[PDB]
Amino acid sequence: MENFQKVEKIGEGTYGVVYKARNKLTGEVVALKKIVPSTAIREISLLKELNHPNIVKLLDVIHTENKLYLVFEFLHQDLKKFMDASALTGIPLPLIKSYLFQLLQGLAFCHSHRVLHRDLKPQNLLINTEGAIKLADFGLARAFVTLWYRAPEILLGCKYYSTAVDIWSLGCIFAEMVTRRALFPGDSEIDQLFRIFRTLGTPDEVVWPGVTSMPDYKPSFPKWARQDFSKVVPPLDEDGRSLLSQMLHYDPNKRISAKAALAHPFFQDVTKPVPHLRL
């Protein structure tokens, strides 16, 4: 640890405080993460091999007296700040398409390695000036406040959810980049659920087999009618609405996978434009 010097507080975290720091020896700039069980130790220790260009690289792990530290590669900005910095004009679709494309590449990689992020949000999606976007905090959930990106199966008490939960979160985020407003802004677990129901229609056995046998499912749930999808993410084109719709399928097994998503017609004319940041 005494191989670092804190440049400045960058942001609080789910499990700890995050710091920008310079490796007193290599002078390199890194993102320090201050977080114990050996399982967690092994668990996060495995992540180090989980390398991909769209996954924020985990440089090292430093466990000292209960004090666990995670060294990560540093990027200058998250997607929440980027979205706010552009709220008035909104992100140019080409960039939205490229970002969603790269994120699907990163999810495809983790998922194949039987890994899930479990908690995707604008805050754990970092960007650089080059036009690339990466996934941060992958694998941390299994090792150990917003519900806006939480998949419905999770909210329904299912304790054995699949990689599909990440896809749902990404779909939610995709909608958010297009509308400049969060798709399902819940302020409680049930409120989160009712907002999903209000937009996608209260699920039943027809669109989601086994849905009613689920843990927190209640027959007393109000019955909201599904809303024509074109009122949800306008003016996203039909290819986009098509892809988004499959990412938001109720039935986790039906919900489109990252790999399949990477071949949707929506990405046919995808590119890699550079955004404009002000560091």
Ligand X SMILES: CC(C)c1cc(-c2cc(N3C[C@H](O)[C@@H](O)C3)ccc2O)nc(N)n1
Known binding residues for ATP are 10-18, 33, 73-75, 78, 121-124, 137
Is residue 153 a contact point for ligand X (CB under 6 A)? Answer: no
Is residue 81 a contact point for ligand X (CB under 6 A)? Answer: yes
What binding mask, one character per residue, do residues 108-127 give for ligand X by CB under 6 A, x or -? ---------------xx-x-
Q: In angstroms, give the least distance from the CB of 123 to ligand X.
A: 5
Nearer to ligand X, 139 or 240 (CB): 139
Is residue 98 a contact point for ligand X (CB under 6 A)? Answer: no
Catalytic residue among 60, 84, 119, 216: 119
Q: In angstroms, give the least distance from the CB of 169 to ligand X.
A: 12
Question: What is the distance between the alpha carbons of residues 78 and 136, in angstroms, rounded to a whole number?
Answer: 10
| Interface region with ligand X, contact rule CB under 6 A, candidates 11-19, 110-118, 171-179, 241-249 | 11-19
Nearer to ligand X, 75 or 244 (CB): 75
What binding mask, one character per residue, do residues 154-193 give for ligand X by CB under 6 A, x or -? ----------------------------------------
- Give catalytic status of residue 119 as yes or no: yes
- Known catalytic residues are 119
